[PDB]
Amino acid sequence: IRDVPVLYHITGAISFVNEIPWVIEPVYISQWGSMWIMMRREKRDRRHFKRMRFPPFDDEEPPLDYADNILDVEPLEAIQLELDPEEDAPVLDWFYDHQPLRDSRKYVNGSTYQRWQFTLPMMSTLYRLANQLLTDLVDDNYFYLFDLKAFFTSKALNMAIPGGPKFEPLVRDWNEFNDINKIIIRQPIRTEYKIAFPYLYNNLPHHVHLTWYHT
Amino acid sequence: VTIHDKTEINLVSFRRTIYLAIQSSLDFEECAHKLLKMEFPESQTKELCNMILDCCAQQRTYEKFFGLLAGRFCMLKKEYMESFEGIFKEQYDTIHRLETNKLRNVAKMFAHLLYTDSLPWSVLECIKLSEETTTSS
Amino acid sequence: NTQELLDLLVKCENKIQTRIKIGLNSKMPSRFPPVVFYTPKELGGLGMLSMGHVLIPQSDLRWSKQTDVGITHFRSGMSHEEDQLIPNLYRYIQPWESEFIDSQRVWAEYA
């Protein structure tokens, strides 16, 4: 259940939910990472998962009445995951609240909920919970020819990288160099080469960004 | 049970598929590409040569497509060279059954192979050109 | 031998099929499989003949505007929902060189 502030017209004509969903980025990612862990365990361990049916109500059932139908009813346990009080001590008490530490002036700015401050035991537990939604690399050398400037140059030259996107060409006579009897062909020049060294393997480079990194 | 099929439907369907590849391609290289892009057991390279042969023979008049296609296969691996020397052997020995148009088309096919040197010039061993030893066909 | 013609043929065949779809009121690829376009008219189809289902050869714009490198790549023509291997008009038409040779020979032996 979530309770939200409402701003409503004096005659029932309209009602606006009057707030913005502010969240703490590592908390939020950790909560969805635990969601992902649990939902995989369930899709694995259920015998027959029955997906509900759409639309949920008839075409002629007027929309339900909250007071009659949903007001008193108990709300039916959610997808929370079972934290172990040994390792997850820093987190056990506020992990699944709506706005986790909204009222603790030691960890958040205040009640308008900007500016969080955490300790490293917290941050390490959060990291460990979010471990499955995250990337397991430490540096940039993975995105060598797959970063932005590589894709900007690829786009500006209308050539494609093996796993990269394609776009429309940015814009759309005789020559004496090109004489093939004069060429020494040892290894075929590929698009990786033309992109790595866009000023040496390229005629008419316009709006070409210069990729290089050896980080 | 272990039903033992002898409808001979795998070969019939092999031939059907090869012929639709040939009659759907445009040049012998696009055809060779679709062929070496389908995959099959090596039990059927014999069938590959003999079938591309018969494909050639049943047509109305020659065009170098079928010769060059078999040529590409034999120029890729040897088994086609083997099977084509055998092919000339048996085709010649049982040629008397062809009406003169298909006989002519077989003759042209072998002429093309020989002058492209996809067959060894040895294969002329078979024509023991006595008068008795040779039918009019 | 005119790789610009093959391009034209793919595009033009596809435009006329697209207009039959447009004439109905949908372009959804599965409502109009090939069978409904290519079936002979004796079976109720439209009886199209096809040249736009071939693989178009490609090789190396750079070297190709110079010396006729050959073929290295094959781009597709039109889309068959699975292999389906639609035949060509070109394989049922006979070349001119062989026609001229057949003719010389046929008339000689007719004499």
Binding site: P162 | - | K11, D60
Partner: peptide, 26 residues
């Protein structure tokens, strides 16, 4: 690797624009 092949956009071709290599290359 786009080596001078395929449509710079497979828009107006009437195809999907897939490119494979000549498998019968040698």
């Amino acid at each position: 690797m786009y080596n001078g092949i395929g449509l710079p956009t497979p828009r107006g071709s009437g195809t999907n624009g897939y490119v494979q290599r000549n498998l019968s290359l040698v």
